[PDB]
Amino acid sequence: GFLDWWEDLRSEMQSITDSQEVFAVLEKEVRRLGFDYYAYCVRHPIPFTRPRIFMFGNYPPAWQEHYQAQNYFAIDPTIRHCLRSGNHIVWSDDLFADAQELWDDARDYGLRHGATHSCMAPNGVMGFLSVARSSPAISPHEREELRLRMRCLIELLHQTLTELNHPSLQPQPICLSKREREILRWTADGKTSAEIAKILGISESTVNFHLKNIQKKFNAPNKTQAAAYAAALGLI
Amino acid sequence: GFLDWWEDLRSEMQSITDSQEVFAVLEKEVRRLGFDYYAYCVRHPIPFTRPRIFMFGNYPPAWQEHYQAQNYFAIDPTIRHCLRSGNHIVWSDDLFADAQELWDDARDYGLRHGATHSCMAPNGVMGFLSVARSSPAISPHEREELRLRMRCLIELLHQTLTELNHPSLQPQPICLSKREREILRWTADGKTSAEIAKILGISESTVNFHLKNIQKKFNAPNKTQAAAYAAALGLI
Ligand SMILES: CCCC(=O)N[C@H]1CCOC1=O
Ligand SMILES: CCCC(=O)N[C@H]1CCOC1=O
């Protein structure tokens, strides 16, 4: 049953070594879930004026290209950072009130019923897993069973991709030293370099050296971007 | 069998009356898991040098005091908002490799074996769940079973306390204005006030004027903490 399903699925993911094998095993499971297509979206908090949004899925090619040209990823409630009750939500006609053009188009493309579960990794990463179909309708008895299985899929997706180091789940890799990480904390808490020189006992001259070295790693012109990026990525 | 227990625990948890009854039924579930002690911890992202931590659990009161007096909550490996190895950490005799002074105190109070699971909410708040015992060791086949039963609990604990609107799960109410948001995003993305004056049709004195009122809400002395604090709270 459930224990059997999760056991075999953990085996397949721990066995592969390519990104394509991940997205082939998922498409198989989603077909077994009773849905026609799926879609996995990973978005990062940085940059704040242009959050990177990545798209992976098997939606009909005519729709994947429509969803990109029509800029639907900017008015889509499914991919929204807002808090969702239980991180799970089923596609409702009223869910797309401020996006009636997106929902209307999706229905004539064979995407009438589906759900979306949103995980959240501690490094700013927030994943969205969507499953869609057209003929069936989410039966209530299936509602609760669907949430549990999809939380399994997106939790094992996150696990395998980050274990395989796929660039979508790796937002701006930056190595921080034990001394460099603790300097950036007190700067992020608003204390000046002259004050951090005593907290750590490393002198003001040497404190500024590490900060500038951190600015170089962040592509940061100043120390305010280095602190904001580090705070959003949970690196601090 | 599993899907049955989840729906049962899900329905019994729907009784939103008091938080005391919530922590009680969680206690009975840990007992059903075969463990003697538990401890739930709510973690807010700021301040970065001393995160606001709310402590709930049935750990020995003298241990929760010694665990707090010595400030182990900052150097303990059981909690870690980073390198989430499957988001599960079956306490290993090697996990406490260095700085394992609290590993002696823990086993003296009767906590020989256990595990800890963590979860992240879109609003930056992060929860930690642990179960402890001292009589047996953790078998690998029940360990794979532990990953699901525990992830379901901390996922249903955040879900419940968010439905009850428990005050510990609420970050500081430091909301920004519309223009105050557009300006904080740019300042956090590294660029100076003089260039934001060019991006918008606004003067440099007016750009730096909002930066003063933004940090007044955060009670921050400089602009670096303001951007860093807003980013952690997901406000930018
Ligand atoms: C998570 C990817 C976005 C997504 O699923 N959008 C939905 C809106 C209607 O048709 C779709 O495909
Ligand atoms: C993860 C929360 C803290 C925790 O459960 N740590 C345990 C390990 C042994 O002594 C403790 O206090």
Residue numbers in the entry:
A (entry chain B), B (entry chain A): 6 to 241
Q: What does the paper behind this entry write?
A:
The majority of traits controlled by rhl transcription factor RhlR depend on PqsE, a dispensable thioesterase in Pseudomonas Quinolone Signal (PQS) biosynthesis that interferes with RhlR through an enigmatic mechanism likely involving direct interaction of both proteins. Here we show that PqsE and RhlR form a 2:2 protein complex that, together with RhlR agonist N-butanoyl-L-homoserine lactone (C4-HSL), solubilizes RhlR and thereby renders the otherwise insoluble transcription factor active. PqsE is a thioesterase that triggers transcription of the RhlR regulon through a hitherto cryptic mechanism, which we identify here as involving a significant chaperone-like component that enhances the stability of RhlR via protein complex formation. In common with many other gram-negative bacteria, two QS circuits use N-acyl-L-homoserine lactones (HSLs) as autoinducers, namely N-(3-oxododecanoyl)-L-HSL (3-oxo-C12-HSL) and N-butanoyl-L-HSL (C4-HSL), which are produced by autoinducer synthases LasI and RhlI and activate the LuxR-type transcription factors LasR and RhlR, respectively.
Indeed, the PROSS-designed RhlR-P75, in which 75 (out of 241) residues were mutated with respect to the original sequence, could easily be produced in E. coli, even in the absence of C4-HSL or mBTL. It crystallized readily in the presence of C4-HSL or mBTL, but not without these ligands. A complex with mBTL diffracted to 2.15 Å resolution and yielded well-resolved electron density for the ligand. A complex with C4-HSL was less well resolved (3.5 Å resolution), but the shape of the electron density confirms similar interactions. Co-expression of RhlR-P75 and His6-tagged PqsE revealed that the interaction between both proteins has been lost by the introduced mutations.
